[PDB]
């Protein structure tokens, strides 16, 4: 099933933001991996991006994905 334990996590949170054109979907990091239960906007970039649900582009990014249908799991 899913996985993300291997070396793959931002020191914490990003900074400026992420372009909506590349951004695909978001995902939360619970369990214990990565700091805080922050959302992870993934894109065709080359790696995962960390961001806490506080900064504007963070709440606005997922809010924009709400309109469309990212086609998530059942």
């Amino acid at each position: 099933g899913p996985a993300s334990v291997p070396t793959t996590c931002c020191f914490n949170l990003a900074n400026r933001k992420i372009p909506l054109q590349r951004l695909e979907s978001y995902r939360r990091i619970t369990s214990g991996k990565c700091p805080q239960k922050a959302v992870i906007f993934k894109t065709k970039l080359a790696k995962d991006i960390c961001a806490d649900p506080k900064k504007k582009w963070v709440q606005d990014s997922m809010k924009y994905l709400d309109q469309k249908s990212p086609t998530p799991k059942p």
Partner: peptide, 16 residues
């Protein structure tokens, strides 16, 4: 510190 929030994020684009 710095500025965790600003317009654009890949002004270079070619960064890819």
């Amino acid at each position: 510190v710095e500025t965790f929030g600003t317009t654009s994020y890949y002004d270079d684009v070619g960064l890819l």
